[PDB]
């Protein structure tokens, strides 16, 4: 009776508004600001009537007729639920401007002005751009935001505080919308069992005493509220983001034994403290699970008897006891031990046909061990930038095929993994690494489907979702590529460079790699480091230079011409 009233009352008027209007702009996405606000400003004076009475005007239609309805004010011509789905159309790299940020005072002016206008902006501008962010975890970014201009814009140096709290949260918000956006293309595009699936094993690490009834609720709950988040029903997924909150702390000796730091918070950090909340020490002494998995004469029935939740919870109990293994780890061992139920118990006698199950492990094991070790080595010498040089090359002759831009941004955050995980203890890297390389992977799968130019990249993408990251590690050199026409001014370079500096420095030097390598894609390591190298001493010291430009114009093609051969 009225879905609108009811959700204004759960959220209240400021969440409401926030999230129609995050609503409103990952739907539209290129329709400008202040037509969103009146839209979302329309939607909330009609709301206040609905929970004043819940049988009003159109008070009792549902929240995608009301606000599906609002937006058409293209091809709006079906009716709900087809409307909505029409989701379909959410742009993963929509090309309005990049977002420029000015200096920490002209946005402090804006702030102290105009403040919610100026926060009403800001998400506005961050959900054009990221359609699938976590909406309720947006909230919470601009309350840190928010935090950030309070407190700064009156300190003594508003530069030196604001900057650095600016910046770390660009980078907690990359990470956050990279994050939900591999849960959306779960749920999306291989349903929800594969979504339940990774929540059990993410789960069951997190909270190794709980029982996996216990699990399984929080797992049902976690499914139902991104379900809805990933489906545009941003108010229903605030409202049951902050129940599950609330359930957990109440249930909390029932589920893990460091949550209480921050069960005590206000609700949006408290979801975001737990979600990212350490694993609890799983209990001191528990059986292996040879005993009931595979020894035991009950189980190829079991497997009949209740083939998902026994799956399940050997799920449960193989992540509960392994904190160390990734995520995509355990389901890659938990998905081969049912491919091995599938068809042993199916042959004359079961048990003999898996005696395998333990030991099938170990290589599944060894082989993301082997590699964040010996990615992290790399890493170890070359520090990230040179790192990320070398995972440039790699995966442009992997997919040459594929949007320079997109190599250059793909590599360069897989080259983020080095740093953020190889400082870990080796117990620890795992988890760290092959799931944010799952991230990272995912962002150039969806990248890639957009304008598909690559099927190799296809392959591997649609194919599954835990065989992404060792699909894509296993493929090297097209062969198959044509090296692209050698344009010169794909290098050149402009004395803008030296303005330009530090990071954006780096991308421009990093995509001229990219094409180098799209147009010798056979070529040493050694040379186009050797090539690569004599860039950065081009721009170094053209930078350093009275120019007039000229330094660039005819140091270039000197190194243009100089630099071609290989």
């Known amino acids: 009776k009225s879905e609108v009233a009811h959700r204004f009352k759960d959220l209240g008027e400021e969440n409401f508004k926030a999230l129609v209007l995050i609503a409103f702009a990952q739907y539209l ?111 919470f970014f601009a309350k840190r935001y928010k935090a950030a201009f309070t407190e700064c814009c009156q300190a003594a140096d508003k530069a030196a505080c604001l900057l650095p709290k600016l910046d770390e949260l660009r980078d907690e918000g990359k990470a956050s ?52 988040c990933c489906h545009g029903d941003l108010l229903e997924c605030a409202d049951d983001r902050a129940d599950l909150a609330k359930y957990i702390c109440e249930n909390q000796d029932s589920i893990s034994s460091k949550l209480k730091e921050c069960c005590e918070k206000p609700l949006l950090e408290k979801s975001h403290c737990i979600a990212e909340v350490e694993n609890d020490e799983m209990p001191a002494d528990l059986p292996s699970l040879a005993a009931d998995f595979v020894e035991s004469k009950d189980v190829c029935k079991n497997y009949a008897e209740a083939k998902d939740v026994f799956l399940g919870m050997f799920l449960y109990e193989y992540a509960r006891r392994h904190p160390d293994y990734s995520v995509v780890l355990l389901l890659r061992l938990a998905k081969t031990y049912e491919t091995t139920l599938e068809k042993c118990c199916a042959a004359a006698d079961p048990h003999e046909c898996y005696a395998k199950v333990f030991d099938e492990f170990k290589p599944l094991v ?82 890639h489907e957009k304008t598909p130019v690559s099927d190799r990249v296809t392959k591997c993408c649609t194919e ?34 030296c303005t330009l500096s530090e990071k954006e420095r780096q991308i421009k030097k990093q995509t001229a790699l990219v094409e180098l390598v799209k147009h010798k894609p056979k070529a040493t390591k050694e040379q186009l480091k050797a090539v690569m190298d004599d860039f950065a001493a081009f721009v170094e010291k053209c930078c350093k230079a009275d120019d007039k430009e000229t330094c660039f114009a005819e140091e270039g093609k000197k190194l243009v011409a100089a630099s071609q051969a290989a």
């Open 29 to 139: 996405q290129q329709c400008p600001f202040e037509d969103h606000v009146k839209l979302v400003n329309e939607v909330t004076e009609f709301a206040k009537t609905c929970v004043a009475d819940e049988s009003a005007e159109n008070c009792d239609k549902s929240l995608h007729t009301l606000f599906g309805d609002k937006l058409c004010t293209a091809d709006c011509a079906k009716q709900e639920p087809q409307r909505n789905e029409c989701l379909q159309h959410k742009d993963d790299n929509p090309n309005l401007p990049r977002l420029v940020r000015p200096e920490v005072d002209v946005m402090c002016t804006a702030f102290h002005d105009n403040e919610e206008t100026f926060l009403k902006k800001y998400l506005y501008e961050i959900a054009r751009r990221h359609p699938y962010f976590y909406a309720p975890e947006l909230l």
């Open 177 to 228: 919308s990279a994050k939900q956006r591999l849960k959306c293309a779960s749920l999306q595009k291989f349903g929800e069992r594969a979504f339940k699936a990774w929540a059990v094993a993410r789960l069951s690490q997190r909270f190794p005493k709980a029982e996996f009834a216990e699990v399984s609720k929080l797992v049902t709950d976690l499914t139902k509220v991104h379900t809805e």
């Open 366 to 447: 060894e082989e993301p061990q082997n590699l964040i070790k010996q990615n992290c080595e790399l890493f170890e010498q070359l520090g990230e930038y040179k790192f990320q040089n070398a995972l440039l090359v790699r995966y442009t002759k992997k997919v040459p095929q594929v949007s320079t831009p997109t190599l250059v941004e793909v590599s360069r955050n897989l080259g983020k993994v080095g740093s953020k995980c190889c400082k870990h203890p080796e117990a620890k890297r795992m988890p760290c690494a092959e799931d944010y390389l799952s991230v990272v992977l995912n962002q150039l799968c969806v990248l």
């Open 464 to 497: 599954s979702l835990v065989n992404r990251r060792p699909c894509f590690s296993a493929l090297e050199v097209d062969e198959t590529y044509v090296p692209k026409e050698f344009n010169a001014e794909t290098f050149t370079f402009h004395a803008d460079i």
